Design a protein around this nucleic acid. Structure first.
Lengths: 89, 93
DNA sequence: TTTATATACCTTTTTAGTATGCAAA
DNA sequence: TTTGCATACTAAAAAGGTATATAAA
């Protein structure tokens, strides 16, 4: 599992659509759909209900989303505070 | 930047060695070295002490290392919890 | 010297892009 | 119908492997 999976999944959940999330991140919709499949096949857990329009998270996917943004918000903290330390000698 | 980069960096710092870390990660040494280089270049900061052999972190790299471990741990915790839920053996309200 | 990391070069794997099918409303 | 996610295929990007040059110890 890479950050790509979280970054993409979060986008899908936030925009409640693959197509809009695709456009938000400036990638094609299919390779986005494939990443979300791979994530789910890796975990062995279905995170989104489909069709169903718009897309909705499953209870598991909801929990996973809530956590994923905590993690991604931390990658931000991590990187930015690292850079702050580099600037200064 | 991806989790693999963190996972690699962590290996190198712990083993204080690219060749040992690469053996543990089951890839060759040259890939590991480039991946680390890429991570450094992508952030634009030096994480490791090149020039000294018992390979050591820079102050920035040290902070980054300590953060990474918490991050990677929370990734495991997320997955572990999600599975617990998904198996329907939740003890989460 | 020896021993470990960086570079050069090539292969394999993964991800992104395009065309299009198919299902939801 | 129109609209949006999925599947099939191709293209590009990125990761990984082997050989070897190079710099610490």
């Amino acid at each position: 599992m890479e950050l790509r999976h979280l970054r993409y999944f979060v986008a899908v959940v936030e925009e409640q659509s693959f197509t809009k999330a695709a456009d938000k991140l400036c990638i094609a919709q299919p390779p986005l759909s494939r990443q979300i499949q791979n994530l789910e096949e890796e975990l062995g857990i279905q995170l989104l209900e489909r069709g169903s329009r718009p897309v909705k998270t499953t209870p598991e996917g909801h929990f996973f989303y809530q956590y994923a943004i905590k993690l991604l918000s931390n990658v931000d903290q991590m990187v930015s505070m690292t850079k702050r330390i580099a600037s200064g000698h």
